[PDB]
Amino acid sequence: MKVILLEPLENLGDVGQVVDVKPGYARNYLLPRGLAVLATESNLKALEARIRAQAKRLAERKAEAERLKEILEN
RNA sequence: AAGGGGACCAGCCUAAACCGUCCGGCUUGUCCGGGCGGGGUCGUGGGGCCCUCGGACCGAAUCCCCAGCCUAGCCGAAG
Ligand SMILES: [Mg+2]
Ligand SMILES: [Mg+2]
Ligand SMILES: [Mg+2]
Ligand SMILES: [Mg+2]
Ligand SMILES: [Mg+2]
Ligand SMILES: [Mg+2]
Ligand SMILES: [Mg+2]
Ligand SMILES: [Mg+2]
Ligand SMILES: [Mg+2]
Ligand SMILES: [Mg+2]
Ligand SMILES: [Mg+2]
Ligand SMILES: [Mg+2]
């Protein structure tokens, strides 16, 4: 069963990563303890749209810096 | 059972794509979810979106009126 980790779990996966676990593990351990969420279509988009937003506000930083490296350095 | 002969006869509304709006979720938006409205309903496949072209006739199974009908009755020839 595919789940999206909400946290880094040792010998499991990284936060935001999609891993495969047995249904019992997900239903009776991860989901109740807030450690993961079902890799459903609905929030596979939620993860995706946040990976997209994080990249958006990052490349905006690496370009509002360069526009300052423009004025300075000259 | 098909088929044939007859009785009767009638076909419609949705879900999803996509659009809009409201609400709340927290993991902040190009988000996800819930409601509502639009859109759509098909097998010659149909629909959505995007271009190009083109701009009155049907009509309920719903509501209204009426005829007709029922729930009392009446006239009715000639020793
Ligand atoms: Mg028959
Ligand atoms: Mg027949
Ligand atoms: Mg008959
Ligand atoms: Mg018929
Ligand atoms: Mg809001
Ligand atoms: Mg939804
Ligand atoms: Mg909605
Ligand atoms: Mg059609
Ligand atoms: Mg088609
Ligand atoms: Mg109807
Ligand atoms: Mg009499
Ligand atoms: Mg008499």
| Helix, coil or strand: residue A9 | strand
- Alpha-helical (H) ranges within A1-74 are 23-25, 41-64, 66-71
Q: Which two tokens stand for residue A69?
A: 């490296």
Report phi then psi at A19, rounded to 5: -125, 165
Residue A19 region by backbone torsions, left for phi larger than 0, else alpha for psi between -120 and 50, else beta:
beta
CA distance A2 to A40: 8
For residues A12-39, one letter each, b for 16 or more C-beta atoms within 10 angstroms of the residue's C-beta and e for the rest, the string is bbeeeeebebeeeebeeebeeeebbbbb
Residues belonging to chain A:
74
CA of A6: nucleotide with nearest C1': B27
The bases of strand B with some atom under 7 A from any protein CB are 27-33
Quickly give A46 CA vs B74 C1' distance in Å.
87
**Which residue type does A43 have?**
N
Q: Which two tokens stand for residue A67?
A: 């526009």
**Which residue type does A10 have?**
E
CA of A56: nucleotide with nearest C1': B30
Burial of A3 (0-12, 13-18, 19+ CB in 10 A): buried
